[model samples]
Target chain A: IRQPLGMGSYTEAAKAQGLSAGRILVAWSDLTADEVLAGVLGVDVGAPVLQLERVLTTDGVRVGLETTKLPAQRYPGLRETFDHEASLYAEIRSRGIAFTRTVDTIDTALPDAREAALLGADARTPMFLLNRVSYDQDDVAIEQRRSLYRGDRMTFTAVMHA
Target chain B: IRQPLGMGSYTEAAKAQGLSAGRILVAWSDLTADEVLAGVLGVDVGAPVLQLERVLTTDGVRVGLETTKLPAQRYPGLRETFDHEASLYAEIRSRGIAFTRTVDTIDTALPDAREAALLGADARTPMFLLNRVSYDQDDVAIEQRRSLYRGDRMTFTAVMHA
Candidate 1:
């Protein structure tokens, strides 16, 4: 938890506890979504979009399964160059894209059968589905990330002055 | 979601979806906890504390099971006054105690057997345990509330700078 009300870097938090952390890219694809996603990314229908899925690990234990989607036009050659690396943010930085802000939506969820296996959880395990939209300096929606995390793994705190 | 990043009235949100909302007080107690809770409430260990448990409803469906605790020394005779009404805040105002700020800790968890029964949810349902500490104008901890909400029922949105 961060002071003014936000969760901090996942890797950094793990590191603070002397735990090793990293992300392993699981898959990537160039896909198409209909009007809803088109409207969100401000892209045309049938436009190219890159989807990347990764498993976030802490002390070599799976904590989150994350997928990121972005308009391919904004980060050209991302699909072409990305390999078996956990440096998606680095790749975005290499492209000179500076993210200005983020909208993080924390949604509660029950792990599906498939998610349960990946999260090393059971049917009774609660989950967090974080839908994050990162915006660029120009306020353009640059990335949309959907992360599934088990409840046993994370907690968040916020101090609000009314 | 509220524009400033805080959750609105739960009842209000349910109302927006045309769902009726209410809380039914299940129980109340004059209780005691050793150190941790006492330290957080700025009260001495073994001090008298009031605890109230309730079930929150939306359209007659159980959505959250909530519990609230406060130092008894601050509000004398609360146990005698609170009689199954969902107006604890109003009662606090009547005692001239003003809450100036709040700290919310959003922790994830699976419903225990008892919680599942009270929530009227299956064991697979995800839960959000909201731990809120309300402080008075003098920065004194006035009340602490723990609320359990299912994922299908709640989502939180936050817009963060940096």
Candidate 2:
């Protein structure tokens, strides 16, 4: 079986739009087409699969997001936790909380072979690393996220503080 | 004036050693050698100088580190804030607070022309961007720091959780 190399989560984006606490999940796995179809339908597909980390927190809690790889079978309940919504931010707003996002850093780097393959990026393709902190209405920093974006598809502009 | 580029603080390290609340300082300047002598001696050094952003915090406070480049004349009292102790970690422990550091990200890039000149680094030299958070006994994050380390002299290692 080919192991998956990367995962993506939208929890921070959801938090940026004001959701306080809930389940956040992401998974990357080398599943057969049938397995993908079964998993998407919320069937309890048996394991041997790798997965991304998930974090659940309460309102006002602070957590450090971990960057690592793990077994996907660890999150068997993820299918139920997944939200089927138009936009995570909109879903959070519909639940009545608001937040503002403050980006802290933006840097560039070349990804490792695994990441390059997972991203469909060339070995020498540059990637952008973005880090941000989201604060809730209470001015409490609720989430911190760091994401890697394909440089070819993304551009960023930032305002300097005087 | 020879701008100074290094300053060390160990409030969090002290907290880890069982101590709490304190001060931290850092400076990045564009000064001639003579101006550096004058500033360290507490004499008024003239303009065209730029300073690094400083972050100040108490035991349970949250504050962002500043990043604007300012003239030496803007902070005449800075000399008095400089600590001449053995080391910041030891100094903080002596004062009775302890802390632990949590590094967030480490990235490398070519320096901007101005920064390269100030750092005495060539345009092609790489510099390391370090971001970290420090927490006290109560697990309250008290300090957030972002520093550019001359890639030639420093290295870092991190352990990731699976």
Candidate 3:
């Protein structure tokens, strides 16, 4: 049975033991395969870990990189400059192992498939949002583009001691 | 000798003291000259009173009716637009009160005469910031011209009590 670390197998286990437990603050989009290998080894890990492995995708290996891009209209000059940058990004993603890109128009600039292998990236332009992903020996890279949002729009929270 | 109400004249008094006290709060901008005259008489008798008024400046009125157009590469277009708008704005000013219009460039739009009146607005295209002076008039009417702005590039703040 899958369970959160230090949380035990069932809710009853924590309640009966009078132990405090909570969900880990991990994002689904950030999990990677190397993390799962470390978790299985029980070696105290410091890098990003995955919640699940063996994701069923056409790539034979699951876990792919995702990227998002803001609309071209938001960036007046990006479409004209994408090709020059895409080649540079591919080299960087190759070092990260696996990669794929996800493009969300709401706040992103480029598409996901563009960085999957290199052929898709051929159509990409300078405005692409590129991010890396890895799964075992097979690595996939994604490119996404997003708007340059105003910093004043967001506020983040974290615990601090007085 | 002059004295407050109920005070004896020097001829019939021996160092008699006169008592006088009063307080009042008036929004001078809210009252016309005639209203101020009536308001003074409506106060209670036998007490010293105070009247307050705000000074209005003809120079503080700004008229944002005309503006310079873009791409701004050619100075002739800018000059032409400025001349057209200036004449129209002057005619509007003769009508007693002026309302703002959507004008793109500030270089040719904001005038020295308007600055003396403090009648200029912020340069942000989609929205304008308001100040205390905007509330001076009793009645206001506005017409909207379409505007577009990047949501990621703009933010607004409003303060109010719960």
**DockQ values per model:** 0.66, 0.06, 0.01
Which regions in candidate 2 have their CA more than 4 angstroms from the true location?
A: A1-47, A52-109, A117-162, B1-74, B77-108, B112-146, B150-162
Candidate 1 - CAPRI tier? Answer: medium
Query: Model 2: per-residue lDDT, tens digit, A67-126?
Result: 322223433443355363233334444545354433234445556786565455665654
The best candidate by DockQ is: 1
Off by over 4 Å in 1: A1-9, A12-19, A82-87, B1-9, B12-19
Q: What TM value does chain A in model 1 reach?
A: 0.85
Report residue B112 deviation for candidate 3 (angstroms).
Answer: 25
Question: What fraction of correct interface contacts does each candidate retain?
Answer: 0.88, 0.01, 0.00
lDDT of 2 by residue, B1-162 (tens): 111111234334434445443444445546532575344323345534434454433243422233323334534543456362224435444544455433234445556786665455565654555454444455443334455544443333211111
What would the per-residue lDDT of candidate 1 be over residues B1-162, giving only the tens digit for each residue?
A: 221335344654666666678888788888885699999899999998889888888777788888989898898777886764456766786788776788888778878899899888886677788888888888999888898886677677888766
lDDT score, candidate 2: 0.40
Ranking by TM-score: 1, 2, 3
Model 1, span A1-162: residue lDDT tens: 221344345655666667787887777888885698888887899888889888888777778888898898887677777654546765776788776788888887777787787677885777778888887778888888898876777666787776
Q: Candidate 3's residue-wise lDDT over A32-79, tens digit each? A: 235543443232344433221111111122112222322122223433
Per-candidate RMSD vs. true structure?
Answer: 3.2, 14.7, 27.3
Docking class of 2: incorrect
Give me the candidate number with maximum lDDT: 1
